[PDB]
Amino acid sequence: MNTVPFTSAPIEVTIGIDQYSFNVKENQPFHGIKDIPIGHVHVIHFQHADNSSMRYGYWFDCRMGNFYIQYDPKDGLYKMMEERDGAKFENIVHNFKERQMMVSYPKIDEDDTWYNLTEFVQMDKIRKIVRKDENQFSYVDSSMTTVQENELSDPAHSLNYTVINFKSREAIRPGHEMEDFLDKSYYLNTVMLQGIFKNSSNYFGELQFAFLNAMFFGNYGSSLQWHAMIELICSSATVPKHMLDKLDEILYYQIKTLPEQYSDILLNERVWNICLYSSFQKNSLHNTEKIMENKYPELL
Amino acid sequence: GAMNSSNYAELFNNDIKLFVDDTNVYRVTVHKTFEGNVATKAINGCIFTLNPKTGHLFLKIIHTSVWAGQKRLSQLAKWKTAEEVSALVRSLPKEEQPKQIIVTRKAMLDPLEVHMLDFPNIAIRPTELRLPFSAAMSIDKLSDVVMKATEPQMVLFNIYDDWLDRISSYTAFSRLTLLLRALKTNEESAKMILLSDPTITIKSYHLWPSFTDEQWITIESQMRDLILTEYGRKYNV
Numbered sequence: 228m229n230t231v232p233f234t235s236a237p238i239e240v241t242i243g244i245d246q247y248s249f250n251v252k253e254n255q256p257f258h259g260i261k262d263i264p265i266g267h268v269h270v271i272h273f274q275h276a277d278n279s280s281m282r283y284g285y286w287f288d289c290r291m292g293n294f295y296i297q298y299d300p301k302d303g304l305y306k307m308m309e310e311r312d313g314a315k316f317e318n319i320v321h322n323f324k325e326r327q328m329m330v331s332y333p334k335i336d337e338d339d340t341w342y343n344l345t346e347f348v349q350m351d352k353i354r355k356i357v358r359k360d361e362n363q364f365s366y367v368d369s370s371m372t373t374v375q376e377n378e379l380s381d382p383a384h385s386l387n388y389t390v391i392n393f394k395s396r397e398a399i400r401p402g403h404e405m406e407d408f409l410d411k412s413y414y415l416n417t418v419m420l421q422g423i424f425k426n427s428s429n430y431f432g433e434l435q436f437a438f439l440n441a442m443f444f445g446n447y448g449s450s451l452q453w454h455a456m457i458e459l460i461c462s463s464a465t466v467p468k469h470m471l472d473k474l475d476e477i478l479y480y481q482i483k484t485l486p487e488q489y490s491d492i493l494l495n496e497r498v499w500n501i502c503l504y505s506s507f508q509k510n511s512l513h514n515t516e517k518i519m520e521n522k523y524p525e526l527l
Numbered sequence: 528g529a530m531n532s533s534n535y536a537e538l539f540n541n542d543i544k545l546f547v548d549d550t551n552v553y554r555v556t557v558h559k560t561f562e563g564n565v566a567t568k569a570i571n572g573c574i575f576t577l578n579p580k581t582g583h584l585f586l587k588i589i590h591t592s593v594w595a596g597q598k599r600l601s602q603l604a605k606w607k608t609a610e611e612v613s614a615l616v617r618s619l620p621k622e623e624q625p626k627q628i629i630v631t632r633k634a635m636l637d638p639l640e641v642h643m644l645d646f647p648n649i650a651i652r653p654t655e656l657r658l659p660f661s662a663a664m665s666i667d668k669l670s671d672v673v674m675k676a677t678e679p680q681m682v683l684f685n686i687y688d689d690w691l692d693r694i695s696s697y698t699a700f701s702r703l704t705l706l707l708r709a710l711k712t713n714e715e716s717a718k719m720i721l722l723s724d725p726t727i728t729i730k731s732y733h734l735w736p737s738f739t740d741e742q743w744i745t746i747e748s749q750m751r752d753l754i755l756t757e758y759g760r761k762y763n764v
């Protein structure tokens with residue numbers, strides 16, 4: 228179990244760690260988060276009490292280094308940093324633990340939620356979507372735009388998700404226009420799975436990462452990406468059975484975790500109604516359809 | 528964006544454009560079978576592709592063989608339309624290719640857009656106008672060439688005959704749309720008006736009769752009356 232110490236908490240802030248959120252007051256003895264489960268990526272995220280503009284945060288994997296948070300009064304945000312001196316870090320953590328100035332990661336033993344939301348998410352793939360190679364962790368915020376959004380403006384601060392565009396030459400084989408537009412299997416299986424992602428695990432990892440950025444930061448381009456990746460699968464008549472079953476599990480846990488009061492902005496009526504009720508896969512997503520119907524029957 | 532009453536004069540500027548109407552591509556007669564079920568029989572159809580500035584009409588005849596063994600024909604017809612328009616564009620020299628294609632029905636947008644991906648600079652537009660191009664098969668010479676076709680065929684017409692020698696494109700389009708609206712509302716009456724006077728003939732190389740300027744004013748007035756007449760018969764006014 229790993230630890231992310233905080234130098235201090237000089238400004239009042241709501242701190243998120245994965246699906247948990249809690250408030251810290253202006254200058255309280257909060258020195259970080261302990262008992263973080265090893266084996267998963269994690270995200271630590273922030274919303275200042277005095278300016279809820281800009282949710283921001285950091286994706287990290289404690290197996291890749293010792294990371295801490297330190298407020299920067301010049302740039303006005305909590306920054307993640309790596310401590311390269313291991314003995315210095317162990318000593319800092321051990322002292323803060325002895326003084327009990329750390330919140331414990333609140334994981335219930337029965338609870339597989341975080342695993343289920345991050346099953347295919349890997350730090351190495353995050354770092355290719357979020358490019359900043361001098362750091363082992365990745366910064367994301369509410370306002371960052373995607374490569375695709377920029378095509379339709381600072382490229383160093385972009386989310387380099389895989390571009391999906393159903394009315395593009397990549398999506399449509401010359402001579403198979405109607406076929407490829409009405410049944411996207413070529414685009415899913417040959418172009419994206421075989422060609423770009425290499426396997427369904429990498430595809431699902433990007434889909435899950437896009438959802439989590441949509442949910443935790445309200446990142447609009449991330450929500451667009453999540454829905455496009457769902458729609459491409461549901462709009463394909465030929466999808467491996469193992470992918471459909473896994474997709475149902477993935478979406479089930481995403482819908483289960485979504486704040487009920489954010490459904491209005493994070494869920495696209497057209498895509499969901501199409502996917503659950505009109506698409507080739509309208510009958511292949513039993514768990515997702517059941518939770519959607521019981522939790523968000525208005526949307527449908 | 529969409530073409531409407533506000534931006535109507537754009538049809539007659541010097542940017543090459545085409546209207547595409549797919550109404551008459553997939554045509555059927557519905558009939559009873561021996562067992563008392565219902566079936567359809569396709570008849571030949573046509574794509575109506577029109578340059579509103581010049582009157583040039585690219586009439587692609589759709590022979591019933593193109594539907595053989597196919598399913599969901601009403602959906603196929605939109606994609607076949609888009610395939611044939613894209614093929615027409617590719618067949619034209621670059622300086623004759625349109626800068627815009629306006630589809631008369633919004634269901635043609637995605638099929639045409641997908642078929643035209645190779646032409647990103649050609650704008651595909653809908654229209655809010657309710658144009659009467661479905662009535663093209665009420666023009667006898669166009670109906671005749673469609674029904675007589677035994678294979679796919681493209682036939683080229685000028686739908687304005689020689690009118691542009693005497694009138695502007697704007698006025699020629701107005702005359703065409705009035706004629707077609709009348710033929711659509713009451714075909715029999717419209718054709719009666721157009722041929723009631725045996726001394727006025729249709730030249731072999733024309734679609735419409737050889738009216739003088741004054742006779743066109745009378746004809747145009749008779750067509751409006753017909754449209755208003757039918758409007759009262761329909762709504763009881």
Ligand SMILES: CCOC(=O)N1CCC[C@H](C(=O)NOC)C1
Binds near residue numbers: 247248257327328
């Ligand atoms: C997730 C659990 O944490 C909370 O719910 N908190 C809000 C109340 C105060 C807690 C705290 O700072 N305790 O150690 C310093 C954090």
